[PDB]
Design a protein around this nucleic acid. Structure first.
Ligand code: NA
Ligand code: NA
Ligand code: NA
Length: 327
DNA sequence: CCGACGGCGCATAGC
DNA sequence: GCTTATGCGC
DNA sequence: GTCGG
């Protein structure tokens, strides 16, 4: 169900969502508007009343009232006020810079720092992440066509095998589910030498190689298990340069690896289904492990996992191929 | 009625 | 100098 | 803002 069906409603709710996150600083209000918005974008009919949307899980009284207002007037008074408040607009715009959240956005705007230009004048007042966010402002809001993702995977997988045959690297996220575009690149890495009860150089080695073939161009944050940064596919000496992309690389213990892959491959709703079914099948699944659930609810010791299917086997589920994991 | 709503790696005041 | 809390992104 | 114990 595309835009023509309920696009005016879900944009209204999304815009309210962003307002509560970035301005009011009310992340649960933001997540409720997101919840309401996503369930309506599923709904396969044009909504003719707020009461009809109220049937849906996540749409409640106040949103149905807003839905009645928008259906009747074509606008939402509350949102029209927000759009005309210059502080609300500047603060919302600034959070679009990676590294600038509601707190920094409001601080900036309170001292008359409102535009990309203003930030440029005051790079002294930015931390490193935020300067990278400013530098790539437009690039970071572009999507990544799957054919580019496949290229990026080739580069990462081959450079990783180059450092050690024994690494395991998986690109996860919507990409692994067959998605046609990606917002970023999320890479799950492990090595059989690194377990839950056992190096400080295992992630760094891979980040180094990737810098040396000039794939990674910037670092937003790097520790011993999580790397966050920027990359770029190589351009033809003769052709327009590809846009810089966001890449994360996560190093995970080998015995928690396939739970990590299962988790970061998702989707979020599928995760909720698989955990729900597993709970009432006597197991609890989190990011790291699957554990048996006792008759009183006491989780036992983690179960050996040697593949994703191992997790489906434990909970008596037919392997759901990543492309079929939309719910 | 009223608390939960995800939680953690990394970068960056107070002692 | 060392520890903790908080912002941020995911 | 919505939900459910
Ligand atoms: Na409802
Ligand atoms: Na931001
Ligand atoms: Na943002």
């Amino acid at each position: 169900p595309q835009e023509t069906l309920n696009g005016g409603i879900t944009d209204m709710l999304t815009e309210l969502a962003n307002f509560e996150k970035n301005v009011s600083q009310a992340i649960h209000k933001y997540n409720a508007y997101r919840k309401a918005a996503s369930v309506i974008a599923k709904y396969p009919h044009k909504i003719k009343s707020g009461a009809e949307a109220k049937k849906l899980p996540g749409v409640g009284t106040k949103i149905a009232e807003k839905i009645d207002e928008f259906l009747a007037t074509g606008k939402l008074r509350k949102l029209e006020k927000i759009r005309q408040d210059d502080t609300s607009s500047s603060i919302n715009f600034l959070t679009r810079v990676s590294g600038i959240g509601p707190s920094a956005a409001r601080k900036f705007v309170d001292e008359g720092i409102k535009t990309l230009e203003d930030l440029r004048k005051n790079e002294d007042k930015l931390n490193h992440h935020q300067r990278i966010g400013l530098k790539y402002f437009g690039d970071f809001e572009k999507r990544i066509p799957r054919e580019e993702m496949l290229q990026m995977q080739d580069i990462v997988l081959n450079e990783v095998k180059k450092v050690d045959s024994e690494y395991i690297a998986t690109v996860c996220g919507s990409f692994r589910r067959g998605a046609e575009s990606s917002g970023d690149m999320d890479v799950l890495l492990t090595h059989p030498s690194f377990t839950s009860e056992s190096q400080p150089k295992l992630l760094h080695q891979v980040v180094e190689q990737l810098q040396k073939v000039h794939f990674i161009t910037d670092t937003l944050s790097k520790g011993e298990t999580k790397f966050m940064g920027v990359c770029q596919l190589p351009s033809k000496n003769d052709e327009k340069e590809y846009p810089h992309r966001r890449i994360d690389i996560r190093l995970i213990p080998k015995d928690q690896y396939y739970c990590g892959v299962l988790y970061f491959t998702g989707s979020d709703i599928f995760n909720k289904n698989m955990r729900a079914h597993a709970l009432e099948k006597g197991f609890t699944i989190n990011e790291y492990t699957i554990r048996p659930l006792g008759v009183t609810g006491v989780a036992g010791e983690p179960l050996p996992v040697d593949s994703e299917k191992d997790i489906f086997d434990y909970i008596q589920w037919k392997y759901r191929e990543p492309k079929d994991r939309s719910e």
